[PDB]
Amino acid sequence: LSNIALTKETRQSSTDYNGFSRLAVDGNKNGDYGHHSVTHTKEDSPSWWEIDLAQTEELEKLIIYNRTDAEIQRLSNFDIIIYDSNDYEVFTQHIDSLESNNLSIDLKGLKGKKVRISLRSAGIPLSLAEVEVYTYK
């Protein structure tokens, strides 16, 4: 397995507090906001974040690392949406809440090019410490 998320092109609904979208693919899973490795949107309707894998890949695993210092509850009631190279949805999963600072999803070789994480409660900022996307097997 290799983490092909690293340094892929990212974007998000908006940015607050220097929480750039790229911070979720910098290879640093520290969720303490002041360690400067956690994304942050404004209070959007909805807040979302997206990664472009640059071409279609066989996806083995997705790992999402939450913020940990404060407001950890914000990463809850959300959707993970995977799209093909033509921007059509190929997979959706709804998440009620995280119990630990992270969630792992096996994708069993699902082919996709883009991954969006989008909150279903409007007004809530999205903050991610790290989103890792594994291919290989």
Ligand SMILES: [Ca+2]
């Ligand atoms: Ca990070």
